[PDB]
Each structure stands twice: as C-alpha cells, then as structure tokens.
Design a protein around this motif. Structure first.
Motif, PDB file in Angstrom:
ATOM      1  N   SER A   9     -53.955  49.437   7.020  1.00  0.00           N
ATOM      2  CA  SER A   9     -53.353  49.654   5.712  1.00  0.00           C
ATOM      3  C   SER A   9     -54.049  50.811   5.011  1.00  0.00           C
ATOM      4  O   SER A   9     -55.266  50.975   5.134  1.00  0.00           O
ATOM      5  CB  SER A   9     -53.449  48.391   4.849  1.00  0.00           C
ATOM      6  OG  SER A   9     -53.142  48.693   3.494  1.00  0.00           O
ATOM      7  N   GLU A  10     -53.287  51.609   4.273  1.00  0.00           N
ATOM      8  CA  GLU A  10     -53.891  52.666   3.463  1.00  0.00           C
ATOM      9  C   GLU A  10     -54.952  52.105   2.529  1.00  0.00           C
ATOM     10  O   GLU A  10     -55.965  52.757   2.269  1.00  0.00           O
ATOM     11  CB  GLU A  10     -52.843  53.415   2.636  1.00  0.00           C
ATOM     12  CG  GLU A  10     -53.460  54.609   1.880  1.00  0.00           C
ATOM     13  CD  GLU A  10     -52.466  55.353   1.034  1.00  0.00           C
ATOM     14  OE1 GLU A  10     -51.325  54.876   0.907  1.00  0.00           O
ATOM     15  OE2 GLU A  10     -52.827  56.414   0.491  1.00  0.00           O
ATOM     16  N   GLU A  11     -54.733  50.892   2.033  1.00  0.00           N
ATOM     17  CA  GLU A  11     -55.572  50.390   0.943  1.00  0.00           C
ATOM     18  C   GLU A  11     -56.678  49.450   1.396  1.00  0.00           C
ATOM     19  O   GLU A  11     -57.256  48.730   0.583  1.00  0.00           O
ATOM     20  CB  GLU A  11     -54.711  49.681  -0.099  1.00  0.00           C
ATOM     21  CG  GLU A  11     -53.614  50.546  -0.655  1.00  0.00           C
ATOM     22  CD  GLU A  11     -54.158  51.794  -1.310  1.00  0.00           C
ATOM     23  OE1 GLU A  11     -55.243  51.714  -1.931  1.00  0.00           O
ATOM     24  OE2 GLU A  11     -53.507  52.851  -1.188  1.00  0.00           O
ATOM     25  N   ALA A  12     -56.970  49.442   2.688  1.00  0.00           N
ATOM     26  CA  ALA A  12     -58.030  48.580   3.196  1.00  0.00           C
ATOM     27  C   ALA A  12     -58.927  49.356   4.136  1.00  0.00           C
ATOM     28  O   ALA A  12     -58.482  50.296   4.800  1.00  0.00           O
ATOM     29  CB  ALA A  12     -57.448  47.371   3.901  1.00  0.00           C
ATOM     30  N   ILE A  16     -49.163  49.706   7.652  1.00  0.00           N
ATOM     31  CA  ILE A  16     -48.474  49.493   6.389  1.00  0.00           C
ATOM     32  C   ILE A  16     -48.908  50.448   5.291  1.00  0.00           C
ATOM     33  O   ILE A  16     -50.075  50.821   5.191  1.00  0.00           O
ATOM     34  CB  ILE A  16     -48.653  48.023   5.878  1.00  0.00           C
ATOM     35  CG1 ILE A  16     -50.108  47.725   5.524  1.00  0.00           C
ATOM     36  CG2 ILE A  16     -48.172  47.036   6.925  1.00  0.00           C
ATOM     37  CD1 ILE A  16     -50.313  46.353   4.835  1.00  0.00           C
ATOM     38  N   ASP A  17     -47.932  50.852   4.482  1.00  0.00           N
ATOM     39  CA  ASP A  17     -48.191  51.540   3.224  1.00  0.00           C
ATOM     40  C   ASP A  17     -47.682  50.645   2.108  1.00  0.00           C
ATOM     41  O   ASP A  17     -46.469  50.551   1.919  1.00  0.00           O
ATOM     42  CB  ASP A  17     -47.487  52.896   3.182  1.00  0.00           C
ATOM     43  CG  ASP A  17     -48.090  53.832   2.140  1.00  0.00           C
ATOM     44  OD1 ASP A  17     -48.802  53.336   1.250  1.00  0.00           O
ATOM     45  OD2 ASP A  17     -47.878  55.053   2.222  1.00  0.00           O
ATOM     46  N   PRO A  18     -48.598  49.954   1.396  1.00  0.00           N
ATOM     47  CA  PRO A  18     -48.185  48.998   0.359  1.00  0.00           C
ATOM     48  C   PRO A  18     -47.388  49.675  -0.765  1.00  0.00           C
ATOM     49  O   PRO A  18     -46.566  49.049  -1.416  1.00  0.00           O
ATOM     50  CB  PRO A  18     -49.527  48.440  -0.165  1.00  0.00           C
ATOM     51  CG  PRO A  18     -50.512  48.667   0.997  1.00  0.00           C
ATOM     52  CD  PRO A  18     -50.066  50.005   1.556  1.00  0.00           C
ATOM     53  N   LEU A  19     -47.671  50.946  -0.995  1.00  0.00           N
ATOM     54  CA  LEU A  19     -46.944  51.737  -1.970  1.00  0.00           C
ATOM     55  C   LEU A  19     -46.988  53.199  -1.551  1.00  0.00           C
ATOM     56  O   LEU A  19     -48.008  53.861  -1.664  1.00  0.00           O
ATOM     57  CB  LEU A  19     -47.525  51.554  -3.382  1.00  0.00           C
ATOM     58  CG  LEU A  19     -46.981  52.501  -4.456  1.00  0.00           C
ATOM     59  CD1 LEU A  19     -45.451  52.468  -4.519  1.00  0.00           C
ATOM     60  CD2 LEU A  19     -47.593  52.217  -5.829  1.00  0.00           C
ATOM     61  N   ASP A  20     -45.869  53.699  -1.067  1.00  0.00           N
ATOM     62  CA  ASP A  20     -45.759  55.108  -0.745  1.00  0.00           C
ATOM     63  C   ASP A  20     -45.066  55.844  -1.900  1.00  0.00           C
ATOM     64  O   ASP A  20     -43.992  55.446  -2.361  1.00  0.00           O
ATOM     65  CB  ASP A  20     -45.007  55.297   0.570  1.00  0.00           C
ATOM     66  CG  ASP A  20     -44.920  56.754   0.985  1.00  0.00           C
ATOM     67  OD1 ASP A  20     -45.939  57.284   1.469  1.00  0.00           O
ATOM     68  OD2 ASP A  20     -43.832  57.353   0.824  1.00  0.00           O
ATOM     69  N   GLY A  21     -45.691  56.911  -2.384  1.00  0.00           N
ATOM     70  CA  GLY A  21     -45.162  57.606  -3.551  1.00  0.00           C
ATOM     71  C   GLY A  21     -45.717  57.006  -4.826  1.00  0.00           C
ATOM     72  O   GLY A  21     -44.995  56.788  -5.800  1.00  0.00           O
ATOM     73  N   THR A  22     -47.019  56.740  -4.804  1.00  0.00           N
ATOM     74  CA  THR A  22     -47.746  56.176  -5.938  1.00  0.00           C
ATOM     75  C   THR A  22     -47.533  56.986  -7.214  1.00  0.00           C
ATOM     76  O   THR A  22     -47.373  56.435  -8.312  1.00  0.00           O
ATOM     77  CB  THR A  22     -49.257  56.088  -5.614  1.00  0.00           C
ATOM     78  OG1 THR A  22     -49.453  55.231  -4.474  1.00  0.00           O
ATOM     79  CG2 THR A  22     -50.039  55.537  -6.793  1.00  0.00           C
ATOM     80  N   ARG A  23     -47.530  58.304  -7.065  1.00  0.00           N
ATOM     81  CA  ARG A  23     -47.268  59.200  -8.180  1.00  0.00           C
ATOM     82  C   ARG A  23     -45.926  58.940  -8.867  1.00  0.00           C
ATOM     83  O   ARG A  23     -45.851  58.831 -10.098  1.00  0.00           O
ATOM     84  CB  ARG A  23     -47.314  60.642  -7.695  1.00  0.00           C
ATOM     85  CG  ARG A  23     -46.991  61.641  -8.776  1.00  0.00           C
ATOM     86  CD  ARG A  23     -47.513  63.002  -8.404  1.00  0.00           C
ATOM     87  NE  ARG A  23     -46.445  63.923  -8.044  1.00  0.00           N
ATOM     88  CZ  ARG A  23     -45.834  64.716  -8.915  1.00  0.00           C
ATOM     89  NH1 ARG A  23     -46.183  64.684 -10.193  1.00  0.00           N
ATOM     90  NH2 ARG A  23     -44.871  65.534  -8.512  1.00  0.00           N
TER      91      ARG A  23
END
Ligand SMILES: Nc1ncnc2c1ncn2[C@@H]1O[C@H](COP(=O)(O)O)[C@@H](OP(=O)(O)O)[C@H]1O
Ligand SMILES: [Mg+2]
Length: 254
Positions: A67-70, A85-92
């Motif tokens: 995961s991007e966030e781990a 996994i990308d829990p949120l792609d396009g955070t901006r």
C-alpha cells in the motif's frame, strides 16, 4: 451463492473494497470539508488505508499487501498473492472542492498478465466501480485526445505533438484518467516522469480486462511486485491507437 471454483471471488472483493473505501472517503470529505486541504488529504489517505488493511487482513489473511500508505516489509517478494492498493489516488483533487477526478485502486497481483483481478472506484462519480470481471471489450483517428496529469504532465508529449495532432486533456488521478479511456472520453492516457505501482496496477488490470492496451512507454509490459515499486511511465489506450503512439514515442528518440 456457492463458493467459487461472507466469501467473495478475488474480483468481487477487489470491487467491494474499492466501494467501501470510496464511501469512507466521501464521509471524510463531508466531515472535514475543504478549509484545510492538507488536513483533508491526510485524513483521506490515512483513513482509507486503515479500512483497507483491516479488511484485507480479515478476509485474505494469507495475502501480502503493498500500500502507498504503509511501510513495505518486502515479504510480498516471496508471496504468490499480493494486493497492490492505492487507498486514495489523486489526493490533491480529493482535497479540492467540486472535483471528481480521484480514485481508489485495488489490484491483486498473482505470480506467473500478473494483475489478475482489479477494481477502480471513482467515488465522487456516483461511487461507480470499474472491475475486471464486469468490464466489457475504432479506426484511423486523425486527431487524438490524450489524458495527462493536471499537475506534472510529461515533457515527451511536446516532442510527439510535432508530428501527431493531439489535444491534451488535463485531469487529476491515474485511475480517473485510465477510466476516461475506458469511457471513451479520451483516446489515451500517457504519463512519464515518475509514478508508483499502486498508481497504475488496478487501472492496468481493468484496462487489459477491457481488451485495451497497457504498457510502458517503450511498449514493454508493466511489471509489478518489484523490489523497487517505482514505475515512472505508461501508455494506456484503445488497441488501435497503441501502434501510432508507441511508434511516435519511439521516433522521438531518433
Ligand atoms: N512525476 C511523478 N512522480 C511521482 N509520482 C507521480 C508523478 N506524477 C504523478 N504521480 C502520482 O500519480 C498519481 C496521479 O497523478 P496525477 O493526478 O498528477 O495524474 C498521484 O498519486 P497519489 O495522488 O496517489 O499520490 C501522483 O502523486
Ligand atoms: Mg495515493
């Protein structure tokens, strides 16, 4: 139903995780609001990640997760099943009022097309979820619409536009841009200059399941579950326009 040949196929689970993280992100948006975009984006990343890791550990306890966030402990390198996994792609874009170009990416990599099952949710678009098990599958296009990053578009586009008629369509999110290709809103999605496996894995799976083209800019296959999950360029497009674009890219090196 009967168990495939709560329990879901990997594709159903991909789809259900994507929707569930999508709903949670929509809740976070409504709760925190847009006054502090940094704060909103952070909570989105973090809360979606927490939900996804909780559910993957409960429902696929034997599978590895990237995961991007781990933190990445690299055990995935030894596994035959890895969720990318990308829990949120396009955070901006998520962090920006009124924008719908952001996504949740849920890909299953299986050792051998290595992305065997995948889903991309676009939560702000009615929480639609594109999935490898339900997506379905022309001619000489005198002019091309190409989705590119609204933030960091690739410099190589300038070169190929000297010879091909192209209108770049500035959009946030790798997932959103890929699904625009599936929708027919653009002919292609082109990126260079940097990206990570979680940014493209689920969109690649869905693109390929749709009978569309997905490769590196040089035409070589996208490879996943690498030691270094940095994966800096891609082309995703209708099958017909791939030789045109891959050729133009190649000729940019002449
Ligand atoms: N040059 C670059 N280097 C690293 N990551 C990049 C990049 N360009 C785009 N990305 C990542 O690719 C995703 C989609 O980008 P864009 O919206 O610019 O098309 C975003 O991921 P996240 O939002 O998951 O961080 C973004 O951070
Ligand atoms: Mg992300």
């Amino acid at each position: 139903h009967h168990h495939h040949h709560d329990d879901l196929t990997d594709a159903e689970l991909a789809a259900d995780l994507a929707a569930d993280a999508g709903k949670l992100l929509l809740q976070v948006r409504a709760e925190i609001g847009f006054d502090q975009p940094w704060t909103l984006g952070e909570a989105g990343d973090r809360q979606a990640n927490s939900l996804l890791l909780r559910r993957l550990q409960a429902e696929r306890p034997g599978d590895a997760v990237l995961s991007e966030e781990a933190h990445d402990d690299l055990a995935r390198l030894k596994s035959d099943r890895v969720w990318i996994i990308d829990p949120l792609d396009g955070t901006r874009e998520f962090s920006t009022p009124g924008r719908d170009d952001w996504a949740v990416h849920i890909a299953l990599w299986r050792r051998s097309p290595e992305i065997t099952d995948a889903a991309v949710a676009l939560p702000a678009r009615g929480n639609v979820v594109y999935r490898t098990d339900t997506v379905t599958s022309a001619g000489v296009p005198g002019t091309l619409r190409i989705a590119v990053s609204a933030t960091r578009p690739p410099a190589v586009l300038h070169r190929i536009r000297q010879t091909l008629a192209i209108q770049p369509v500035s959009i946030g999110s790798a997932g959103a841009k890929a699904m625009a290709v599936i929708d027919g809103y653009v002919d292609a999605y082109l990126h260079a200059g940097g990206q990570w496996e979680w940014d493209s894995a689920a969109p690649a799976g869905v693109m390929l399941a749709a009978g569309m083209h997905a490769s590196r800019l040089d035409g070589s296959p996208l490879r996943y579950n690498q030691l270094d999950p940095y994966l800096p360029d891609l082309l995703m497009c209708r099958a017909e326009v791939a030789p045109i674009l891959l050729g133009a890219i190649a000729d940019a090196w002449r």
